[PDB]
Design an enzyme around this catalytic site. Sequence first.
Site, PDB file in Angstrom:
ATOM      1  N   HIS A  61       0.880  -1.522  -0.141  1.00 33.26           N
ATOM      2  CA  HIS A  61      -0.190  -0.061  -0.028  1.00 33.26           C
ATOM      3  C   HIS A  61       0.493   1.551   0.159  1.00 33.26           C
ATOM      4  O   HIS A  61       0.887   2.220  -0.575  1.00 33.26           O
ATOM      5  CB  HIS A  61      -0.823   0.246   1.420  1.00 33.26           C
ATOM      6  CG  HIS A  61      -1.540  -1.264   1.227  1.00 33.26           C
ATOM      7  ND1 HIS A  61      -3.038  -1.356   0.108  1.00 33.26           N
ATOM      8  CD2 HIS A  61      -2.224  -1.744   1.966  1.00 33.26           C
ATOM      9  CE1 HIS A  61      -3.793  -2.743   0.712  1.00 33.26           C
ATOM     10  NE2 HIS A  61      -3.257  -3.048   1.264  1.00 33.26           N
ATOM     11  N   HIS A  93       2.661   8.649   1.366  1.00 34.57           N
ATOM     12  CA  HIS A  93       1.672   9.165   0.555  1.00 34.57           C
ATOM     13  C   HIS A  93       2.069   9.946  -1.179  1.00 34.57           C
ATOM     14  O   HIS A  93       2.589  10.799  -0.447  1.00 34.57           O
ATOM     15  CB  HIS A  93       0.669   8.994   0.427  1.00 34.57           C
ATOM     16  CG  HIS A  93      -0.038   8.338   2.221  1.00 34.57           C
ATOM     17  ND1 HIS A  93      -1.066   7.166   1.909  1.00 34.57           N
ATOM     18  CD2 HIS A  93       0.105   8.464   3.563  1.00 34.57           C
ATOM     19  CE1 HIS A  93      -1.507   7.266   3.026  1.00 34.57           C
ATOM     20  NE2 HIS A  93      -0.099   7.878   4.154  1.00 34.57           N
ATOM     21  N   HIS A 116       3.732  11.340   6.808  1.00 40.59           N
ATOM     22  CA  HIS A 116       3.012  10.757   8.164  1.00 40.59           C
ATOM     23  C   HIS A 116       4.112  10.069   9.482  1.00 40.59           C
ATOM     24  O   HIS A 116       5.267   8.960   9.049  1.00 40.59           O
ATOM     25  CB  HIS A 116       2.422   9.824   7.924  1.00 40.59           C
ATOM     26  CG  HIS A 116       0.969  10.541   7.916  1.00 40.59           C
ATOM     27  ND1 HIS A 116       0.007   9.729   6.323  1.00 40.59           N
ATOM     28  CD2 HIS A 116       0.977  12.023   7.027  1.00 40.59           C
ATOM     29  CE1 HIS A 116      -1.075  10.880   5.643  1.00 40.59           C
ATOM     30  NE2 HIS A 116      -0.576  11.593   6.083  1.00 40.59           N
ATOM     31  N   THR A 195      -5.518   6.949   8.085  1.00 40.31           N
ATOM     32  CA  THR A 195      -6.477   7.367   6.560  1.00 40.31           C
ATOM     33  C   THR A 195      -6.391   5.791   5.877  1.00 40.31           C
ATOM     34  O   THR A 195      -6.294   5.932   4.562  1.00 40.31           O
ATOM     35  CB  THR A 195      -5.377   8.333   6.103  1.00 40.31           C
ATOM     36  OG1 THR A 195      -3.831   8.049   6.022  1.00 40.31           O
ATOM     37  CG2 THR A 195      -5.831   9.483   6.345  1.00 40.31           C
ATOM     38  N   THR A 196      -5.970   4.696   6.522  1.00 41.97           N
ATOM     39  CA  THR A 196      -5.995   3.936   5.782  1.00 41.97           C
ATOM     40  C   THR A 196      -6.807   2.677   6.904  1.00 41.97           C
ATOM     41  O   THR A 196      -6.603   3.000   7.772  1.00 41.97           O
ATOM     42  CB  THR A 196      -4.922   2.774   5.762  1.00 41.97           C
ATOM     43  OG1 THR A 196      -3.662   2.703   7.030  1.00 41.97           O
ATOM     44  CG2 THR A 196      -3.831   3.832   4.220  1.00 41.97           C
TER      45      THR A 196
HETATM   46  C1  LIG Z   1       0.568   0.388  12.046  1.00 38.66           C
HETATM   47  C2  LIG Z   1       0.405   1.813  11.286  1.00 38.66           C
HETATM   48  O1  LIG Z   1       0.680   2.589  11.821  1.00 38.66           O
HETATM   49  N1  LIG Z   1      -0.352   1.471  10.271  1.00 38.66           N
HETATM   50  C3  LIG Z   1      -1.172   2.857   9.714  1.00 38.66           C
HETATM   51  N2  LIG Z   1      -2.127   2.690   9.390  1.00 38.66           N
HETATM   52  N3  LIG Z   1      -2.568   3.814   8.407  1.00 38.66           N
HETATM   53  C4  LIG Z   1      -1.282   5.645   9.189  1.00 38.66           C
HETATM   54  S1  LIG Z   1      -1.489   7.333   8.374  1.00 38.66           S
HETATM   55  N4  LIG Z   1      -1.354   6.757   6.972  1.00 38.66           N
HETATM   56  O2  LIG Z   1      -3.009   7.288   8.903  1.00 38.66           O
HETATM   57  O3  LIG Z   1      -0.326   6.769   9.277  1.00 38.66           O
HETATM   58  S2  LIG Z   1      -0.485   4.242  10.777  1.00 38.66           S
HETATM   59 ZN   LIG Z   2       0.219   7.839   6.005  1.00 36.14          ZN
HETATM   60 ZN   LIG Z   3      -2.895  -5.041   2.981  1.00 33.84          ZN
END
Ligand SMILES: CC(=O)Nc1nnc(S(N)(=O)=O)s1
Ligand SMILES: [Zn+2]
Ligand SMILES: [Zn+2]
Length: 257
Positions: A61, A93, A116, A195-196
Site C-alpha cells: 500500500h 503517500h 506521516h 487514513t487507511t
Molecule cells: C501500523 C500503523 O502505523 N498503521 C497505520 N495505518 N495508517 C497510518 S496513517 N496513513 O494514517 O499514517 S499509520
Molecule cells: Zn500515512
Molecule cells: Zn494489506
Amino acid sequence: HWGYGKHNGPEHWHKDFPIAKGERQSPVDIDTHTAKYDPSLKPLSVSYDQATSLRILNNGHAFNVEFDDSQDKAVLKGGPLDGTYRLIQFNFHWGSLDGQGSEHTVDKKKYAAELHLVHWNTKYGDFGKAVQQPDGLAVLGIFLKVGSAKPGLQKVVDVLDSIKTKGKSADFTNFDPRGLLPESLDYWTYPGSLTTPPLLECVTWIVLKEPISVSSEQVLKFRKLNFNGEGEPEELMVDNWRPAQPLKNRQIKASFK
Ligand SMILES: CC(=O)Nc1nnc(S(N)(=O)=O)s1
Ligand SMILES: [Zn+2]
Ligand SMILES: [Zn+2]
C-alpha cells in the site's frame, strides 16, 4: 482486499470498514481562514536524537520505515498533546503526477506527497492498545513539494530498489528522521483517524504549515514501487492517498496567526 484501484479504492472501504463514514475521519481540507488560532497551544517538542530505525518495508500500500519503540528514544510531546508519544514508524503517500499525492489539502491545494510520522501514547503500553483510544495516536503530517532536493531523504530513495514489490523488507539502520523536518514547527491540529483501514478514530493530527522540498528525481523513484507481489502483473504504486473527508463540525486549531 482493500486498495486504491477502481474496484477496491477509498469509495469502497465503507463496505468492510463502516467507520469510513464516521464522525472524525481523516484526511480533511484545511481552510486557513476558518481555522482558529489558539494562543493556549504550546510549542511542539520533537526529541528524535536517540531514534533507532530498524527496517524499511513495502506492505503493498506504501512503504514504511520502522523504529525501535521499546523505550522513549524518539518522542513527541507538547503542542495539543498530553503525555509522551513514542515514534513507531513513518510512511508516505504520493501521486502519479506532481499536482496530487497528499492526503490533507490546504485551501483545496494538493501537494506532491505527504509524510506521516506516527507516534503512540505511552500511557497505553503498546501500539495495539493505543489505537483503541480516542487519544491513542499523534501523527505528524508534513507536505512535500517538488523543487530542490532534500539531502536527508536520499538514503530512503536509494534503498527503494531493494523493496520494489509487496512483502519485501530491508534492514534500514541509523536513519535520522530529523533530516525530514521543515525549518518551522508551526502547525494546525484537529481530532481525526487513520487514513487507511481499519480507519480507527484514535488520532490527534498535527499538520505542519511549512512543506519540505524534494527534487523531481526523488519523487520519481517513489513512483517506481509496485503494489503487486513479485511474479505478479506489475501495478505501479502511485496515488495511494485517500480524498478529503467531511469536517463535520470539528474545529481546526492553528498554533500561529
Ligand atoms: C501500523 C500503523 O502505523 N498503521 C497505520 N495505518 N495508517 C497510518 S496513517 N496513513 O494514517 O499514517 S499509520
Ligand atoms: Zn500515512
Ligand atoms: Zn494489506
